Amino acid sequence: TTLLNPYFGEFGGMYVPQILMPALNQLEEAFVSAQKDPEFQAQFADLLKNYAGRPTALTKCQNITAGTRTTLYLKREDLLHGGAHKTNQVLGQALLAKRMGKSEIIAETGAGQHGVASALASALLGLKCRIYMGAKDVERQSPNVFRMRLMGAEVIPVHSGSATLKDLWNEALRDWSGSYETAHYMLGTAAGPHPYPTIVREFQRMIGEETKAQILDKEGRLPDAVIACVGGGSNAIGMFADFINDTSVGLIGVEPGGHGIETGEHGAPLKHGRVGIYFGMKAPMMQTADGQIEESYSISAGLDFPSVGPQHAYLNSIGRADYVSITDDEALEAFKTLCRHEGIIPALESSHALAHALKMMREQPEKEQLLVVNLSGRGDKDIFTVHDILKAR
């Protein structure tokens, strides 16, 4: 039994082998006591500010909404240390681990961003970190690999399956199911078994809390909508959580549409997939008619988790949040537009959110709307990807 409700409506749960329940309940209990622990709080806050650089700027776009009645702010998680919002929660989870007495951390990554973030938090905090990565991404994500080992982290090559996020995720769980007594599994997004969706959200929620204070100081009023990309759901639930009871603020989650919903090659399980049970939870996921789990496709490798956090599936079902999709091409156009008009290179993940915001502005240009886009990361890491696509045209 649990201290917190593991379900958001029908979604969520703890669908893991019985052997892992105790680790999960132990993780839940430590989080609840760390949450009412003022030392814990003060310590997480200090690292976020003096080490990660919070609070991040809330920057008003000047040139891109020219000629419309849209005012657009970007919450600058691209300026966080590590270049993405993932640093916030690996710091929190790494403290939690220490608070549990764990000394080792297991993480898995595809593109390698969560891998880099787990390795910096572990380097800082004295934790030994092992990261599963696909045998092929090691070949192409050399830059990220090299960073992780520069950080002291052990990178473990996987050859089981396709080396897709799915198999990295399984490889990591299998290992945890043998070493949970000393290792803490640092899940990368707000999905997976309880209490992970709740813990990653609480550890990302300062995004929305800063944006609310910052928009209120600069505009004197809450936004009309906050928009965020959704690959597993953590930057988005981080941005949304504080506005959930401000019912006039729209919450918009943007999944990758890939090549286009019609083709089948996308990564939008929330709106186009089917409830399944996998990743330790019950949520919408990409799967065959036969129940085999499938891949998510996106030009950004960072939006490919083929399922989505359970609190997003539940906010969508009661109609508190709306979820849309943005194709590769639309995300690339937004990526070029932000570089040229504001001098900010955005991660291609974040470009999906920004393209949705641009479409809102462009479709109805005389609609007066105060929008906040969660710029979840910076796009230096995507420069070759965008270059090569652009070379090809």
């Binding site: 669908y15 893991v16 082998p17 019985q18 052997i19 399984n170 199911s177 043998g178 049970i277």
Partner: protein, 262 residues
Amino acid sequence: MERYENLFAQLNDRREGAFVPFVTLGDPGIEQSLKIIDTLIDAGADALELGVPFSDPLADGPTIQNANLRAFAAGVTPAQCFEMLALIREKHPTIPIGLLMYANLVFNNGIDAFYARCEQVGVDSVLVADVPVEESAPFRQAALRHNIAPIFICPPNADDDLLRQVASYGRGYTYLLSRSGVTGAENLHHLIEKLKEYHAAPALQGFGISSPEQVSAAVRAGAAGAISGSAIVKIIEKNLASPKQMLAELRSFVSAMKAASR
């Protein structure tokens, strides 16, 4: 039916532990799998534990991950699995057959419908590897409405609260996990005692059991028998290009494990 009650009545009247082989259905192809299963039974298997090919076997080591991939290479689907299963029950009327499933396959088309199809094909039990007792209500209810025994894992780290739930909810046999980690041929008195004290379905030990002394030992500890998978899957694996040898190697491992149950 009551295939497990009856098989354990029979085994107890002859003071023998159960020997239960696990294989992935359809590995390495449907006909060969059908022949591997007949050979297992012919060799003395008292019951069968059968895996349905799933895309993400998260509680399974590499030997069995590889048996899942071979099955998919052969094009095996859940549907083909059920036809195979009805062919097995038609050939062997009294052997208890249990499925090892992952949750998404049971839930996919309706939990109750998955258990209705087990009942029609003659399956006797189902173990869903990623459904802990805490989430099992819908699963165990649907199994009991279709006369299917819902099997639960009793892990090495079980507390007393779990022991009692396992005993009250499980039927057929109690799956006794030999260690942490995952299936794999490469890697409990009190649990056993408490299970009998709480009137749990007879336990079967598994995970890591690979040799005949192990079988003898489990029975001696009080387990009613042992399951073994990776060590049978390895034999299939080794002899992939020589089928005849595959059955002869299988035949011999089985009778040796079976003879150790006595």
